[PDB]
PDB file of C-alpha atoms in Angstrom:
ATOM      1  CA  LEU A1503      -3.341  19.532  41.807  1.00  0.00           C
ATOM      2  CA  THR A1504      -4.509  15.133  41.072  1.00  0.00           C
ATOM      3  CA  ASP A1505      -4.708  14.884  37.482  1.00  0.00           C
ATOM      4  CA  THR A1506      -4.343  11.668  35.262  1.00  0.00           C
ATOM      5  CA  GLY A1507      -3.229  13.112  32.605  1.00  0.00           C
ATOM      6  CA  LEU A1508       0.011  10.044  32.001  1.00  0.00           C
ATOM      7  CA  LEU A1509      -0.354   7.869  29.435  1.00  0.00           C
ATOM      8  CA  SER A1510      -3.724   5.998  29.694  1.00  0.00           C
ATOM      9  CA  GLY A1511      -6.631   4.937  27.853  1.00  0.00           C
ATOM     10  CA  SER A1512      -6.884   9.020  26.331  1.00  0.00           C
ATOM     11  CA  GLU A1513      -2.330   8.645  25.854  1.00  0.00           C
ATOM     12  CA  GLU A1514      -3.463   5.765  23.253  1.00  0.00           C
ATOM     13  CA  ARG A1515      -5.588   7.703  21.843  1.00  0.00           C
ATOM     14  CA  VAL A1516      -4.278  10.546  21.126  1.00  0.00           C
ATOM     15  CA  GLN A1517      -0.750   8.578  20.055  1.00  0.00           C
ATOM     16  CA  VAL A1518      -3.292   6.565  17.521  1.00  0.00           C
ATOM     17  CA  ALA A1519      -5.205   9.844  16.324  1.00  0.00           C
ATOM     18  CA  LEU A1520      -1.908  11.450  15.974  1.00  0.00           C
ATOM     19  CA  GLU A1521      -0.428   7.869  13.541  1.00  0.00           C
ATOM     20  CA  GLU A1522      -3.241   8.279  11.856  1.00  0.00           C
ATOM     21  CA  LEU A1523      -2.374  12.003  11.064  1.00  0.00           C
ATOM     22  CA  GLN A1524       0.526  11.462   9.881  1.00  0.00           C
ATOM     23  CA  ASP A1525      -0.791   8.585   7.311  1.00  0.00           C
ATOM     24  CA  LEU A1526      -2.805  11.501   6.419  1.00  0.00           C
ATOM     25  CA  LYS A1527      -0.726  13.892   5.869  1.00  0.00           C
ATOM     26  CA  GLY A1528       1.797  11.966   3.669  1.00  0.00           C
ATOM     27  CA  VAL A1529      -1.620  10.848   1.653  1.00  0.00           C
ATOM     28  CA  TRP A1530      -2.063  14.423   1.379  1.00  0.00           C
ATOM     29  CA  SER A1531       1.416  15.405   0.580  1.00  0.00           C
ATOM     30  CA  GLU A1532       1.669  12.171  -2.346  1.00  0.00           C
ATOM     31  CA  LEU A1533      -2.257  13.748  -3.415  1.00  0.00           C
ATOM     32  CA  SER A1534      -0.490  16.970  -3.994  1.00  0.00           C
ATOM     33  CA  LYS A1535       2.687  15.822  -5.565  1.00  0.00           C
ATOM     34  CA  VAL A1536       0.543  13.569  -8.038  1.00  0.00           C
ATOM     35  CA  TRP A1537      -2.117  15.996  -8.461  1.00  0.00           C
ATOM     36  CA  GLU A1538       0.555  18.679  -9.770  1.00  0.00           C
ATOM     37  CA  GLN A1539       1.617  16.464 -13.353  1.00  0.00           C
ATOM     38  CA  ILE A1540      -2.352  15.422 -13.556  1.00  0.00           C
ATOM     39  CA  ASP A1541      -3.770  19.208 -13.875  1.00  0.00           C
ATOM     40  CA  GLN A1542      -0.607  19.932 -16.060  1.00  0.00           C
ATOM     41  CA  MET A1543      -1.121  16.984 -18.156  1.00  0.00           C
ATOM     42  CA  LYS A1544      -5.507  18.479 -17.527  1.00  0.00           C
ATOM     43  CA  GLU A1545      -4.355  21.794 -18.813  1.00  0.00           C
ATOM     44  CA  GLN A1546      -2.202  21.124 -21.492  1.00  0.00           C
ATOM     45  CA  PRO A1547      -3.830  22.324 -24.866  1.00  0.00           C
ATOM     46  CA  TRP A1548      -5.603  19.584 -27.386  1.00  0.00           C
ATOM     47  CA  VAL A1549      -4.010  21.478 -29.863  1.00  0.00           C
ATOM     48  CA  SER A1550      -0.795  21.038 -28.098  1.00  0.00           C
ATOM     49  CA  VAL A1551      -0.730  17.725 -27.250  1.00  0.00           C
ATOM     50  CA  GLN A1552      -3.429  15.206 -28.311  1.00  0.00           C
ATOM     51  CA  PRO A1553      -5.019  12.641 -26.777  1.00  0.00           C
ATOM     52  CA  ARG A1554      -1.792  10.267 -26.082  1.00  0.00           C
ATOM     53  CA  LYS A1555       0.184  12.953 -24.694  1.00  0.00           C
ATOM     54  CA  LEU A1556      -3.180  14.253 -21.911  1.00  0.00           C
ATOM     55  CA  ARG A1557      -3.624  10.336 -21.685  1.00  0.00           C
ATOM     56  CA  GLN A1558       0.449  10.308 -20.788  1.00  0.00           C
ATOM     57  CA  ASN A1559       0.147  13.035 -18.446  1.00  0.00           C
ATOM     58  CA  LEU A1560      -2.726  11.667 -16.773  1.00  0.00           C
ATOM     59  CA  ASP A1561      -0.604   8.440 -15.814  1.00  0.00           C
ATOM     60  CA  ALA A1562       2.367   9.873 -14.844  1.00  0.00           C
ATOM     61  CA  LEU A1563      -0.119  12.309 -12.728  1.00  0.00           C
ATOM     62  CA  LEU A1564      -1.338   8.977 -11.475  1.00  0.00           C
ATOM     63  CA  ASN A1565       2.191   6.801 -10.628  1.00  0.00           C
ATOM     64  CA  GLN A1566       2.958   9.966  -8.532  1.00  0.00           C
ATOM     65  CA  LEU A1567      -0.252  10.109  -6.462  1.00  0.00           C
ATOM     66  CA  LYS A1568       0.058   5.865  -5.912  1.00  0.00           C
ATOM     67  CA  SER A1569       3.367   5.525  -4.145  1.00  0.00           C
ATOM     68  CA  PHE A1570       1.896   6.813  -0.778  1.00  0.00           C
ATOM     69  CA  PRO A1571       2.144   3.899   1.709  1.00  0.00           C
ATOM     70  CA  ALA A1572      -1.030   1.805   3.092  1.00  0.00           C
ATOM     71  CA  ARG A1573      -2.201   3.991   5.674  1.00  0.00           C
ATOM     72  CA  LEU A1574      -1.505   7.140   2.824  1.00  0.00           C
ATOM     73  CA  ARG A1575      -4.208   5.445   0.240  1.00  0.00           C
ATOM     74  CA  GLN A1576      -6.617   5.092   2.972  1.00  0.00           C
ATOM     75  CA  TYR A1577      -6.500   8.271   4.468  1.00  0.00           C
ATOM     76  CA  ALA A1578      -8.214  10.129   1.262  1.00  0.00           C
ATOM     77  CA  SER A1579      -4.973  12.226  -0.184  1.00  0.00           C
ATOM     78  CA  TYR A1580      -3.458  10.077  -2.242  1.00  0.00           C
ATOM     79  CA  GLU A1581      -7.104   8.695  -3.655  1.00  0.00           C
ATOM     80  CA  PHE A1582      -7.794  12.672  -4.584  1.00  0.00           C
ATOM     81  CA  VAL A1583      -4.380  13.462  -6.428  1.00  0.00           C
ATOM     82  CA  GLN A1584      -5.221   9.678  -8.804  1.00  0.00           C
ATOM     83  CA  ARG A1585      -8.665  11.340  -9.380  1.00  0.00           C
ATOM     84  CA  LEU A1586      -7.441  14.711 -10.062  1.00  0.00           C
ATOM     85  CA  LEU A1587      -4.521  13.013 -11.874  1.00  0.00           C
ATOM     86  CA  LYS A1588      -7.659  10.555 -14.076  1.00  0.00           C
ATOM     87  CA  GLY A1589     -10.116  13.118 -15.057  1.00  0.00           C
ATOM     88  CA  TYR A1590      -6.542  15.699 -16.436  1.00  0.00           C
ATOM     89  CA  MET A1591      -6.242  12.013 -18.510  1.00  0.00           C
ATOM     90  CA  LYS A1592     -10.105  11.846 -19.390  1.00  0.00           C
ATOM     91  CA  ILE A1593      -9.710  15.834 -19.820  1.00  0.00           C
ATOM     92  CA  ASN A1594      -6.869  15.323 -22.478  1.00  0.00           C
ATOM     93  CA  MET A1595      -8.079  11.936 -23.729  1.00  0.00           C
ATOM     94  CA  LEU A1596     -11.536  13.478 -24.603  1.00  0.00           C
ATOM     95  CA  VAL A1597     -10.158  16.600 -26.017  1.00  0.00           C
ATOM     96  CA  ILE A1598      -8.312  13.919 -28.531  1.00  0.00           C
ATOM     97  CA  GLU A1599     -11.340  12.355 -29.420  1.00  0.00           C
TER      98      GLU A1599
END
């Protein structure tokens, strides 16, 4: 059979999708790594850790989730990890307040 399965425009689209998916997977991994520390800071009790400790945990989660590349930051994974870390830090700060 005479099939056009070589590196055509479809092949270029497949390669671009694979590169974008690698970037998105990196962003998701960085977001999960940051969100682990962010969730730890958020789940730290108000009596156990003050608002300063909650803010420190949220900032550590944001720093962990902000280490992704440009493609990772374009992907939603790192941004959502940073959002979860910021939410945990805000929960700690509100508990301290």
